[PDB]
Design an enzyme around this catalytic site. Structure first.
Site, PDB file in Angstrom:
ATOM      1  CG  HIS A 194     -46.227  -4.774 -21.855  1.00 21.88           C
ATOM      2  ND1 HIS A 194     -46.502  -6.065 -22.253  1.00 21.88           N
ATOM      3  CD2 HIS A 194     -45.048  -4.446 -22.433  1.00 21.88           C
ATOM      4  CE1 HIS A 194     -45.535  -6.495 -23.042  1.00 21.88           C
ATOM      5  NE2 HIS A 194     -44.639  -5.532 -23.168  1.00 21.88           N
ATOM      6  CG  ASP A 220     -47.974  -8.329 -17.154  1.00 24.36           C
ATOM      7  OD1 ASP A 220     -48.580  -7.401 -16.580  1.00 24.36           O
ATOM      8  OD2 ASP A 220     -46.839  -8.718 -16.808  1.00 24.36           O
ATOM      9  CB  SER A 251     -43.560  -8.251 -26.845  1.00 21.02           C
ATOM     10  OG  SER A 251     -44.563  -7.282 -27.091  1.00 21.02           O
TER      11      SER A 251
END
Lengths: 151, 151
Positions: free
Chosen positions: A29, A51, A103
């Site tokens: 993402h 992901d 992240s």
């Protein structure tokens, strides 16, 4: 410390990529490109089921890759912003630590081995439950608690 | 110390042959003849799949044979030109150690047992990875990393 690289877009930092074993992993993402001139030329495979995107590490960089395991005993673990507590099959971090854009950070064991990659987290009053991707023999799995949000 | 014999070609040193267990082992890709007058008279068998040649040890030389095992725990080992570390299923040494013509050297365990024969390796900046011929219960096996070159 050396195995973490930044992904940038229009001058801003979107997230990090990490070298583990012989593969490069980047959260699906996260937008942008990789600053390293040689890594930016790699082709990637995508899977929206976890992901994850991954690619093969070129030969001359292999000496910089981190070690990994699959064992997950109960205890305390360390990461960039402090310690993380593992109990009951879930990762918990004191409230207030962590913000969007951070992240892709690894979680390390006492000997510096990678056990999980953090991809967001949930909202709770005193303590935060993390959303992680982990692995096992010949498989990967995505573990997402209720209320998790992307970082 | 006593189990190593030198192989030469037209006056130049090409490599070494090892006397291990009940067999004499020599890498297939090395040219030349054996300096020992008695060993030069033996018949040899060949297999190009593992790059090995071997012959049976003559009766009166058997007292020079080294001992061997098959157990390979993670840890540190030694060889003629320094230390070697074994972890992750691979043997690695610091960059700059090892030169063409040194192939065929043994790797020794703490108690003097033979565990491997080294035949080249792959080279990167800080570290190198060795290409080795090893064995297991009732078989032999060849392990070669990507990009390996002969010594």
């Amino acid at each position: 410390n050396d195995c973490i690289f930044e992904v940038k877009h229009e001058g801003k930092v979107m997230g990090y990529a990490c070298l583990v074993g012989d593969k490069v992993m980047k959260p699906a993402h996260v937008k942008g490109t990789i600053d390293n001139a040689d890594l930016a030329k790699l082709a990637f495979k995508r899977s929206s089921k976890y992901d994850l995107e991954c690619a093969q590490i070129p030969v001359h960089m292999k000496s910089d890759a981190s070690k990994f395991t699959h064992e997950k005993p109960e205890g305390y673990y360390n990461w960039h912003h402090g310690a993380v507590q593992y109990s009951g099959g879930r990762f918990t971090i004191p409230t207030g630590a962590g913000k969007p854009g951070d992240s892709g950070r690894p979680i390390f064991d006492n000997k510096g081995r990678v056990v999980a990659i953090v991809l967001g987290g949930a909202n709770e009053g005193a303590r935060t439950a993390l959303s992680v991707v982990t692995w096992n023999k010949d498989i990967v799995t995505k573990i997402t608690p209720e209320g998790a949000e992307e970082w």
